[PDB]
Amino acid sequence: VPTLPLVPXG
Amino acid sequence: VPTLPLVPXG
Amino acid sequence: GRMKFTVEREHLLKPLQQVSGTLPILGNLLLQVADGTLSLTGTDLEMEMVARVALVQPHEPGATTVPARKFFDICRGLPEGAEIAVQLEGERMLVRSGRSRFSLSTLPAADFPNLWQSEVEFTLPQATMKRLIEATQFSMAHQDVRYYLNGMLFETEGEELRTVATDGHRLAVCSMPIGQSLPSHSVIVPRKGVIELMRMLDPLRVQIGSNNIRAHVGDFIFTSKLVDGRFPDYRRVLPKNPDKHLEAGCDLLKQAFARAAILSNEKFRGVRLYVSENQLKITANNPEQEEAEEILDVTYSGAEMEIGFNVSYVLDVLNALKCENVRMMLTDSVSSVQIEDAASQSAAYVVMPMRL
Amino acid sequence: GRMKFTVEREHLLKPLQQVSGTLPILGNLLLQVADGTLSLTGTDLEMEMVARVALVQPHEPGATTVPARKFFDICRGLPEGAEIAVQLEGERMLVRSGRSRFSLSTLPAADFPNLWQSEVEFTLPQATMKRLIEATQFSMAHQDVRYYLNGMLFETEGEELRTVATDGHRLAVCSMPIGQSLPSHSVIVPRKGVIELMRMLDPLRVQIGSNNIRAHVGDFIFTSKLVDGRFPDYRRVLPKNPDKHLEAGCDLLKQAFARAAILSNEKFRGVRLYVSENQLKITANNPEQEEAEEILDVTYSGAEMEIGFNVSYVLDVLNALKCENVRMMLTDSVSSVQIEDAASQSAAYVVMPMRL
Ligand SMILES: [Ca+2]
Ligand SMILES: [Ca+2]
Ligand SMILES: [Ca+2]
Ligand SMILES: [Ca+2]
Ligand SMILES: [Ca+2]
Ligand SMILES: [Ca+2]
Ligand SMILES: [Ca+2]
Ligand SMILES: [Ca+2]
Ligand SMILES: [Ca+2]
Ligand SMILES: [Ca+2]
Ligand SMILES: [Ca+2]
Ligand SMILES: [Ca+2]
Ligand SMILES: [Mg+2]
Ligand SMILES: [Mg+2]
Ligand SMILES: [Mg+2]
Ligand SMILES: [Mg+2]
Ligand SMILES: [Mg+2]
Ligand SMILES: [Mg+2]
Ligand SMILES: [Mg+2]
Ligand SMILES: [Mg+2]
Ligand SMILES: [Mg+2]
Ligand SMILES: [Mg+2]
Ligand code: NA
Ligand code: NA
16 A cells, blocks of 8 residues: 655645 | 433433 | 257346345245246245246246345346346356356256235335334334344224334334224244335335235245244323423424533443423533533423433434324423324323433 | 523533543543633643633633533533533532433533733635645544654735645645735645634634744634644645646546546556547556546647546646636656646646656
8 A cells, every 4th residue: 555655645 | 302202211 | 958048137126236235045936937027035044035026028937046145236237228138057047248248157947935914904105114114213222132123013093004213212103004904913023024015115006914914015025034922012002191292393392402412421321301481401411521501482371390211212203293282291390201293192202211 | 609501402512512622631621701701621631622602691700620521512412492500529420301300420610721922913804714724634644653744834925824735746836826025934734733723714814923824713712732843845845847738628637537437557556647638548457457547638739648546636736726727738758747727827736746
């Protein structure tokens, strides 16, 4: 369950 | 909080 | 060959919806193809719903059980007008429509439970059954330790069918003529059975058995177990000689109680009625010392009296009556009231007061 | 004399309903009579709603606070056309209409909380604000430890107002022209503030402040605190060069995903997409080894690829688009997809795949 590349937290 | 005269239980 | 059928979506959809209304096989529908007919059955081990659907297209007899909500959701999700082909493939049921495919787990038809001895039988309009149930359903108990109060009495007497419901604080009774001479019989239908019967009432034939009741509606058959126990006799609950008669408009009375209720105790919901010559005063107060007062013109010529009620129970009756004028029949401040449509005696409601 | 007014029910009702949308005084409305106007204010200490009602009838200036839901329910419960008289009596507010009376507890107006520095101001149609919010609201986080994701970014840039929402698994962005040259500003409106703003959008003037946002709609003014924190930059989230473009009818695609979803894992909701020349295959299976397959004609001329998605996130996008044809913009099986209306670039949606 990868995340979107949010900075931080993905 | 009286009950109706149900037999049993009122 | 094994069970196989092809059917239009719109021939399957409403029957599937109705039968689809725990243990794995109890979440499945039994599907049976025989003699040009698809039968669909759902059960919870106490009640059962069976639908019959005519098969217009070629088919092969057989039977299986398949998850009910999944099969319904698939059929509903297919486009309007879709043709739905069903066949069995090993331990699965294959559903095909267009370029859509669904393979559902099955359990063997032989493992599906099956229920019978009939004692009285009559036919009546669906609207009559619906009136009987709607007139009294709200007064059934909910999870009372007296299990027989959690359902609804159905009684045949003379040419009438009657329903009774009570929770110990209020009682509702409704009778309607059936135009057939009936034996005397009285059975208790459990709450969930009453709810299912209402879902079908969209004539009706009823068979009351020893331990079960059955309803035939169109191409559906519903069966429910009955509840054991001795249901109260409503004739003993009705006030004996209520000598003080108040008549009021039903809308105005309901609206006044509904406003007063706003400032009643949230737990106990008590309101006070003061009856005087052609006048009713309703008051409510709460622990915050807020106060509501409503004064209404009514028809009343008895002694003055003050009586307390749980306003929710009063509103429940007034909302069930749906009539022009209501009659309240009073005795004293510690005895139940009888409430009825001023223009009809088909239903009666009995509500116990609270102490002031 | 103390506060006193008389007002028609239908002049009070909708304003009361809207402002009525913890601590005792925070359950009250502040009522103020001044200069021919009744003002009604509700708050939860972070946001506030103020309504102004013109007073046609004689009145006396003053102020109090009164329980909001009780006062609303009383006014709604009065008959159509009722005139409602309000005055203060000691520590209570007396409401009279017809022969109905209600005495409500009050708390002093001086104890009611009150909030301000404005930085950008613009006007736009209510339908435009509603489109911006509805396009992105479903992608806001719910109770994420990253508090700034639990709300919605509102950004002004050029002549456009933009909303952005993301929960880390999907992102939604929508931009609309305002026809005014705007300074660049970006603030985070908390979830509950977004919900309140939507309730008002039945033109709109917006002021964005240092730590608060304000919306003027008719005779209402809504104010919300803003959320601190650094909201993600959507420009960095959009896929950089999505080289594989699929177009499909939105209804047919949504219907197919909705059917496949029935046989997906209830917890993980994964479906698999296989893209090939002018074709999309959607498959789902679950722990019971049930299987769904949907094949659709689409427009696609890229390399074949297989990619997994949480079907709920895909359906959320397709339901928000409400258009004729959708474009999915793909890169590879471990990179996000961009989804948009084939006919409009006002909104874009980014959804992260699941691993297969
Ligand atoms: Ca057809
Ligand atoms: Ca049709
Ligand atoms: Ca086979
Ligand atoms: Ca299953
Ligand atoms: Ca009448
Ligand atoms: Ca009569
Ligand atoms: Ca009027
Ligand atoms: Ca009016
Ligand atoms: Ca006074
Ligand atoms: Ca209060
Ligand atoms: Ca298009
Ligand atoms: Ca464009
Ligand atoms: Mg199969
Ligand atoms: Mg049977
Ligand atoms: Mg129905
Ligand atoms: Mg008895
Ligand atoms: Mg009694
Ligand atoms: Mg007073
Ligand atoms: Mg202020
Ligand atoms: Mg609204
Ligand atoms: Mg960033
Ligand atoms: Mg990515
Ligand atoms: Na009270
Ligand atoms: Na799966």
